[PDB]
Design an enzyme around this catalytic site. Sequence first.
Site, mmCIF file in Angstrom:
data_model
loop_
_atom_site.group_PDB
_atom_site.id
_atom_site.type_symbol
_atom_site.label_atom_id
_atom_site.label_comp_id
_atom_site.label_asym_id
_atom_site.label_seq_id
_atom_site.Cartn_x
_atom_site.Cartn_y
_atom_site.Cartn_z
ATOM 1 N N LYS A 55 99.349 25.655 59.264
ATOM 2 C CA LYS A 55 99.868 25.843 57.918
ATOM 3 C C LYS A 55 99.605 24.597 57.077
ATOM 4 O O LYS A 55 100.162 23.540 57.348
ATOM 5 C CB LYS A 55 101.367 26.146 57.969
ATOM 6 C CG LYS A 55 101.978 26.573 56.641
ATOM 7 C CD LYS A 55 103.427 27.001 56.752
ATOM 8 C CE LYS A 55 103.947 27.667 55.496
ATOM 9 N NZ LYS A 55 105.359 28.132 55.670
ATOM 10 N N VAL A 95 97.469 29.762 55.630
ATOM 11 C CA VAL A 95 97.980 29.916 56.982
ATOM 12 C C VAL A 95 96.870 30.520 57.838
ATOM 13 O O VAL A 95 96.556 31.699 57.689
ATOM 14 C CB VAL A 95 99.247 30.793 56.996
ATOM 15 C CG1 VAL A 95 99.864 30.881 58.384
ATOM 16 C CG2 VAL A 95 100.275 30.316 55.980
ATOM 17 N N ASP A 115 103.017 27.781 67.614
ATOM 18 C CA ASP A 115 102.662 28.767 68.620
ATOM 19 C C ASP A 115 102.416 30.099 67.924
ATOM 20 O O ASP A 115 103.287 30.587 67.211
ATOM 21 C CB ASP A 115 103.781 28.968 69.642
ATOM 22 C CG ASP A 115 104.047 27.759 70.520
ATOM 23 O OD1 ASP A 115 103.177 26.866 70.562
ATOM 24 O OD2 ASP A 115 105.131 27.719 71.142
ATOM 25 N N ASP A 126 115.960 33.424 53.710
ATOM 26 C CA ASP A 126 114.791 34.253 53.455
ATOM 27 C C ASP A 126 114.605 35.239 54.602
ATOM 28 O O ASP A 126 113.631 35.155 55.350
ATOM 29 C CB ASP A 126 113.521 33.418 53.249
ATOM 30 C CG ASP A 126 112.324 34.230 52.776
ATOM 31 O OD1 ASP A 126 112.513 35.415 52.441
ATOM 32 O OD2 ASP A 126 111.207 33.674 52.751
HETATM 33 C C1 VQE Z 1 104.632 35.864 57.260
HETATM 34 C C2 VQE Z 1 103.769 35.457 58.445
HETATM 35 C C3 VQE Z 1 103.965 33.998 58.904
HETATM 36 C C4 VQE Z 1 103.345 32.972 57.942
HETATM 37 C C5 VQE Z 1 104.022 31.607 57.970
HETATM 38 C C6 VQE Z 1 103.443 33.767 60.307
HETATM 39 C C7 VQE Z 1 102.639 34.719 60.974
HETATM 40 C C8 VQE Z 1 102.188 34.462 62.273
HETATM 41 N N1 VQE Z 1 101.417 35.306 62.994
HETATM 42 C C9 VQE Z 1 100.939 36.591 62.440
HETATM 43 C C10 VQE Z 1 99.635 37.098 63.063
HETATM 44 C C11 VQE Z 1 99.606 38.579 62.675
HETATM 45 C C12 VQE Z 1 101.036 38.933 62.239
HETATM 46 N N2 VQE Z 1 101.158 39.171 60.799
HETATM 47 C C13 VQE Z 1 101.894 37.742 62.688
HETATM 48 N N3 VQE Z 1 102.577 33.264 62.813
HETATM 49 N N4 VQE Z 1 102.253 32.811 64.048
HETATM 50 C C14 VQE Z 1 102.842 31.616 64.124
HETATM 51 C C15 VQE Z 1 103.536 31.311 62.955
HETATM 52 C C16 VQE Z 1 103.351 32.376 62.127
HETATM 53 N N5 VQE Z 1 103.823 32.560 60.878
#
Ligand code: VQE
Lengths: 306, 252
Positions: free
Chosen positions: A38, A23, A90, A135
């Site tokens: 992803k 990711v 996004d 989840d």
């Molecule tokens: C578990 C984190 C999930 C993984 C699928 C995630 C995290 C972020 N951003 C992160 C950036 C720093 C913070 N940990 C949030 N985004 N942004 C779009 C989609 C998405 N998904």
Amino acid sequence: YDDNECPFCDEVSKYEKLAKIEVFKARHRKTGQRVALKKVLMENEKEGFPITALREIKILQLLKHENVVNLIEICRTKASPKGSIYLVFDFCEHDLAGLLSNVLVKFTLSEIKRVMQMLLNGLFYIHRNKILHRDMKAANVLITRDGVLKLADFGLARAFSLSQPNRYTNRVVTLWYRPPELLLGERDYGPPIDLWGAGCIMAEMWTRSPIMQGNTEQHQLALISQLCGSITPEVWPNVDNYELELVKGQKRKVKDRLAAYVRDPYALDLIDKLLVLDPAQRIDSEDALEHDFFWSDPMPSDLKGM
Amino acid sequence: NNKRWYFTREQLENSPSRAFGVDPDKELSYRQQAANLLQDMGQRLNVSQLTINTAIVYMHRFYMIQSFTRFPGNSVAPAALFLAAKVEGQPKKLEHVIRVAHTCLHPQESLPDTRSEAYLQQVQDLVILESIILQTLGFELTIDHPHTHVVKCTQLVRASKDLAQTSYFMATNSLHLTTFSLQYTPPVVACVCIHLACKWSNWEIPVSTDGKHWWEYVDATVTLELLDELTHELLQILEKTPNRLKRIWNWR
Ligand SMILES: CCC(CC)c1cc(N[C@H]2CC[C@H](N)C2)n2nccc2n1
């Protein structure tokens, strides 16, 4: 061999990888918008393109709402000399788990209230379209720069419709955030497994800490049985149509244990209405949204944790 | 948009199959043939009619981007199924789809060894085209079909066991024999299927006491000029399709 012909698939390299959250963070090399990408697929996947993917992909496309992370598009790689297929989201500045674990960023009750209203409405929407999340954890609650709450990890998310007795997936959710029904192996459940989770995540706003950390599955069952008491046909009518185990001689203490960290009368109650054994007696989203913790002072305010 | 996978008659005229030297009518036959395979294959796999129809829609959209000279009907169809199966939640083993595909296309030839590079390649080719059709469609895999709008509409105008299931059959055949999937929306298509089924089953439905005709409740973008234009197009191609109208013809 090749295709060299694709109108609605993009090439991912239009977005520029920065760092990993497979990711990545990314930025569009023209508009300069930040996205998250992803990867998917593997050598493990030895039966066509992953179906679990097609499930998630199809769900993300269906779900469009204020508080449910957006799939922009699904871009693809070039012929193998990164590789595979990428899901574009996004970018969401912070997750919830990071803001809690982070000691600096502290919220007002005013700011804490709104957070929930976004979440529970989020859940409302996804359940409304007959898709369970399966989840619910702090890390799966994303929040934007503006302060827009989003939900993530719809990998586990499944389409539902209770007809006869149906057979849903058994071991789902994180073990910490897992609810009772699932810990007895219920395979015809519905939304209020999430609404449970939300409760664990709600309390986690104050505790700043995963409130239950059962290593064994009966260790989990034990920590919850401290809260709800013994697992009774009293509290949960017809609990004895499934499952001897342990800790069926306890007494309740939901509010009183975490009372020192909430302080708010209205909130304590909202937690306890989510945190019930019986899913039929576990408050739905609407009931919560219309509850008078959302309509009480100080009222919900917009996010600006900074 | 809701008008990306929709096209004018001249848009169909200038399909990718055209510019690689294939006639307008010849293309339809290339299409019509992909359905029959999808259908027959689908029957041997015990997948739904929905799955089969959804598989036909993918291919109907697919050959708006690619050319049949470039990709054969036979190479694409088993992919369009294998995918549609997984999409509509009747996943079939890849081995399974290949058995069937083989015995359909090559009836005398018993299947090659599952070890031989021959098979292991005709394994890959399929995996290949699955990936390709995802890219071609842009992973737009959810399909509304004209059947959903019929089944509701028939009850909501108390149709018989006959007229209802005839109407259903017309729709199933509006995918095989025509490019109605690419031109008109499912609700419009539904009405065409019922409007013909009525004229054929010799039962013109009564108008509602408000004054609105039955078709106005199904889709308001519909008119009798259009139904009588289209029903005739579909009847004709059914007339041509052999022992097709016999399936719905009353011997009594
Ligand atoms: C578990 C984190 C999930 C993984 C699928 C995630 C995290 C972020 N951003 C992160 C950036 C720093 C913070 N940990 C949030 N985004 N942004 C779009 C989609 C998405 N998904």
